[PDB]
Design an enzyme around this catalytic site. Sequence first.
Site, PDB file in Angstrom:
ATOM      1  N   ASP A 148     -12.795   7.813   9.484  1.00  0.00           N
ATOM      2  CA  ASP A 148     -12.533   7.407   8.101  1.00  0.00           C
ATOM      3  C   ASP A 148     -13.005   5.958   7.818  1.00  0.00           C
ATOM      4  O   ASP A 148     -12.269   5.150   7.253  1.00  0.00           O
ATOM      5  CB  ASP A 148     -11.063   7.676   7.689  1.00  0.00           C
ATOM      6  CG  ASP A 148     -10.829   7.751   6.174  1.00  0.00           C
ATOM      7  OD1 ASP A 148     -11.826   7.900   5.414  1.00  0.00           O
ATOM      8  OD2 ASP A 148      -9.660   7.660   5.749  1.00  0.00           O
ATOM      9  N   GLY A 204       0.812  -1.213   0.000  1.00  0.00           N
ATOM     10  CA  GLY A 204       0.000   0.000   0.000  1.00  0.00           C
ATOM     11  C   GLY A 204       0.839   1.254   0.000  1.00  0.00           C
ATOM     12  O   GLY A 204       1.915   1.278   0.589  1.00  0.00           O
TER      13      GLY A 204
HETATM   14  C1  6LQ Z   1      -0.318  -9.960  -2.068  1.00  0.00           C
HETATM   15  N1  6LQ Z   1      -1.428  -8.999  -1.964  1.00  0.00           N
HETATM   16  C2  6LQ Z   1      -2.382  -9.411  -0.926  1.00  0.00           C
HETATM   17  C3  6LQ Z   1      -3.690  -8.645  -1.178  1.00  0.00           C
HETATM   18  N2  6LQ Z   1      -3.460  -7.185  -1.356  1.00  0.00           N
HETATM   19  S1  6LQ Z   1      -4.661  -6.143  -0.882  1.00  0.00           S
HETATM   20  O1  6LQ Z   1      -4.583  -4.990  -1.703  1.00  0.00           O
HETATM   21  O2  6LQ Z   1      -5.886  -6.850  -0.717  1.00  0.00           O
HETATM   22  C4  6LQ Z   1      -4.198  -5.662   0.771  1.00  0.00           C
HETATM   23  C5  6LQ Z   1      -3.386  -4.546   1.034  1.00  0.00           C
HETATM   24  C6  6LQ Z   1      -3.050  -4.229   2.342  1.00  0.00           C
HETATM   25  C7  6LQ Z   1      -3.471  -5.046   3.400  1.00  0.00           C
HETATM   26  C8  6LQ Z   1      -3.163  -4.730   4.813  1.00  0.00           C
HETATM   27  C9  6LQ Z   1      -2.847  -5.732   5.746  1.00  0.00           C
HETATM   28  N3  6LQ Z   1      -2.660  -5.437   7.028  1.00  0.00           N
HETATM   29  C10 6LQ Z   1      -2.683  -4.178   7.498  1.00  0.00           C
HETATM   30  N4  6LQ Z   1      -2.453  -3.958   8.852  1.00  0.00           N
HETATM   31  C11 6LQ Z   1      -2.964  -3.092   6.603  1.00  0.00           C
HETATM   32  C12 6LQ Z   1      -3.037  -1.677   7.031  1.00  0.00           C
HETATM   33  O3  6LQ Z   1      -2.787  -1.393   8.193  1.00  0.00           O
HETATM   34  N5  6LQ Z   1      -3.357  -0.751   6.078  1.00  0.00           N
HETATM   35  C13 6LQ Z   1      -3.553   0.639   6.194  1.00  0.00           C
HETATM   36  C14 6LQ Z   1      -2.769   1.433   7.040  1.00  0.00           C
HETATM   37  N6  6LQ Z   1      -2.997   2.744   7.150  1.00  0.00           N
HETATM   38  C15 6LQ Z   1      -3.897   3.381   6.426  1.00  0.00           C
HETATM   39  C16 6LQ Z   1      -4.718   2.674   5.570  1.00  0.00           C
HETATM   40  C17 6LQ Z   1      -4.569   1.290   5.441  1.00  0.00           C
HETATM   41  C18 6LQ Z   1      -5.463   0.596   4.426  1.00  0.00           C
HETATM   42  N7  6LQ Z   1      -4.707  -0.300   3.528  1.00  0.00           N
HETATM   43  C19 6LQ Z   1      -3.608   0.335   2.745  1.00  0.00           C
HETATM   44  C20 6LQ Z   1      -3.317  -0.704   1.647  1.00  0.00           C
HETATM   45  C21 6LQ Z   1      -4.776  -1.145   1.280  1.00  0.00           C
HETATM   46  C22 6LQ Z   1      -5.582  -1.031   2.595  1.00  0.00           C
HETATM   47  C23 6LQ Z   1      -3.257  -3.399   5.255  1.00  0.00           C
HETATM   48  C24 6LQ Z   1      -4.267  -6.150   3.125  1.00  0.00           C
HETATM   49  C25 6LQ Z   1      -4.608  -6.464   1.825  1.00  0.00           C
HETATM   50  C26 6LQ Z   1      -2.197  -6.635  -1.927  1.00  0.00           C
HETATM   51  C27 6LQ Z   1      -0.999  -7.600  -1.752  1.00  0.00           C
END
Ligand code: 6LQ
Lengths: 350, 350
Positions: free
Chosen positions: A147, A29
């Site tokens: 949010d 991300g």
């Molecule tokens: C291999 N793939 C697996 C699936 N994805 S996905 O886009 O579905 C995805 C992306 C990020 C996470 C993720 C997993 N664990 C976390 N703790 C966080 C997180 O904390 N994200 C976050 C932090 N701060 C602000 C916003 C967010 C929201 N995320 C940012 C990336 C997408 C959601 C995000 C999970 C799936 C991409 C990589």
Amino acid sequence: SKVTTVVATPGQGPDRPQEVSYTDTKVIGNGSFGVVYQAKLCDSGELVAIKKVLQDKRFKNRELQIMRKLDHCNIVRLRYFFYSSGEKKDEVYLNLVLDYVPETVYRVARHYSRAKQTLPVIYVKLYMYQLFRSLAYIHSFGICHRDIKPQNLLLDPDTAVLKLCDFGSAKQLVRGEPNVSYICSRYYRAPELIFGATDYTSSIDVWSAGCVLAELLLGQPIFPGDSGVDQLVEIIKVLGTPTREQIREMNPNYTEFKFPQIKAHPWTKVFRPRTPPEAIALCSRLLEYTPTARLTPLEACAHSFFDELRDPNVKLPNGRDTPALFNFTTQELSSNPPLATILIPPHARI
Amino acid sequence: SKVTTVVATPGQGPDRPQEVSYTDTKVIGNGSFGVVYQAKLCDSGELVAIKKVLQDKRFKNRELQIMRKLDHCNIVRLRYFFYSSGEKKDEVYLNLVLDYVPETVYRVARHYSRAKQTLPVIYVKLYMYQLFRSLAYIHSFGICHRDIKPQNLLLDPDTAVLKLCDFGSAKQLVRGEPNVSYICSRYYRAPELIFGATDYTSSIDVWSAGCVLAELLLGQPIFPGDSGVDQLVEIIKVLGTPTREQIREMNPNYTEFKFPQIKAHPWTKVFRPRTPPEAIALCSRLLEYTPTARLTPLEACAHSFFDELRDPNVKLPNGRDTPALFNFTTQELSSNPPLATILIPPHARI
Ligand SMILES: CN1CCN(S(=O)(=O)c2ccc(-c3cnc(N)c(C(=O)Nc4cnccc4CN4CCCC4)c3)cc2)CC1
Ligand SMILES: CN1CCN(S(=O)(=O)c2ccc(-c3cnc(N)c(C(=O)Nc4cnccc4CN4CCCC4)c3)cc2)CC1
């Protein structure tokens, strides 16, 4: 592979730093926040997410201060935090080591939408209940997420576990103190926010959660539009025109502004014919003009819609058992302790 | 094919209705307002757009009243208007018969973006100059568009003519009178709007135009974000932190909340190395915190960036001549008549 070793402070408990080693670092991300990485802990093999944000030293990081106080099964846990460099020379980065949850409600809702299918109602109950539990929790400390949206709702497809993430906009709302109205993402913003209210309560998260419920039921956002005016038109088309009283309850500086006199649309015609009546009734009760008229997260958890989750025979489509749903704390129930009579069903593990 | 005959009033001039017959009716847009259709006039064969909106009956349509007063080469003309029905009984529909312009700045910007190319600088000058001329015109009547964005900027690719459209959010801004801050679409909203100011001026359209210029130069929006907070962070990253004076100029209810102290970034590092310095200087002067510090549309038209348009040898890439650019009216020049010394080049004076 490349192994990174850091001296990270644990998120909860005494300030006792530890050597934390991690590998297989991939970016997952990139946003206004900063960068979110996935990494594997060398010790456990356990997957984690690392949120990297530039720290000012000018003040303490608000998100970290909030994260450090939280411990809930439906919230992404702050495991560790540490400081580093990485993009800017001579500048500090705060790194939040968090639980890794594999999917987002956003991506899952998108799969179903693309396949002209809707997310099965069992998942709508599981995901929405878990969101309300996380909201009951943060709200009990006076903390507003600010949010709530599908991109901030993480899921484990195998376990049906939902975990709230992004505490970047989170703030402790104190009565009488003014707060910025420019928080919250398009489609998910409560009418008070659209009207520029600085006196809003934690009931803005309830409106957002209600928009998320309606979107999972519809297969598209309930109140779309790239402007506040377009969003408000869509709200009025469903809720009907707000009264002079309802306008006052949101923002009293918008009472003398004329609105299009639209009839109060029947909520049953909003959704597809097969839509359960309790789901419609839940939307109705969350998506209310008057912020005080909205259900609270704990009341929402106790709504008829979620009764199937309290059934002792409930199972996941993959055969597995439902995740933790009844392990309520005193803190979590604090807003209305009698609700535990509904919330904790007789069979609930003890 | 199916022929529709109506007794439509002409948009401009005396109220003298005429029998207008049209065919080949296809939907070309669906939004908050209602529906936009494309149709062929049986008479001329000329293509038109018909905007169908549900009429309030309680009061006159503000878009119609604005449209009727306008006549500019860079504004979609209201050819006729008539009343009808569609959904279903008691419900009256206002139909605005408008000029049909084949492309949008949105779709064109998207083509180049997809092909990892940028719109040639000659088109950036042609389209931006023409937008500023349309803005100088509407602003001279005290009218603010309030929704400037690529989707509302129509183009004729063959003639290089740009025509402003969508007068749904347009309003005559009277000093001392309060206006809704929830107008304007994400990415294009001025900081005063993000801050919920109800005392904003016509310079909100200038900020929006400046965002459109920077987007055509970058190949992506300059200030993205799905929340006001994210948008503001992106603005601060370029413009630097706003001063307490600058905060006061926008909204003096936000002078108390302190912001991330980020240095005033050099506008040269924002764009690709090839980017003309006058284009950078133009964004710099349009995208200003202090609404009064922004160039006016007429001053923008007179900026160095547009000098090539004033060259007597300027030609379009297809070989054709540039569209009308110097036929300024007294009304159009009213804000600053001496600017006509720069605006009307010697070869247009013969
Ligand atoms: C291999 N793939 C697996 C699936 N994805 S996905 O886009 O579905 C995805 C992306 C990020 C996470 C993720 C997993 N664990 C976390 N703790 C966080 C997180 O904390 N994200 C976050 C932090 N701060 C602000 C916003 C967010 C929201 N995320 C940012 C990336 C997408 C959601 C995000 C999970 C799936 C991409 C990589
Ligand atoms: C065959 N193709 C041709 C190209 N398109 S397109 O999407 O590029 C398109 C769509 C609409 C127009 C259009 C042409 N003439 C007009 N006068 C209006 C118009 O007035 N649009 C409008 C009215 N009210 C509010 C907003 C708008 C903005 N447009 C509606 C569709 C997006 C732009 C819109 C031009 C191209 C679709 C059909």
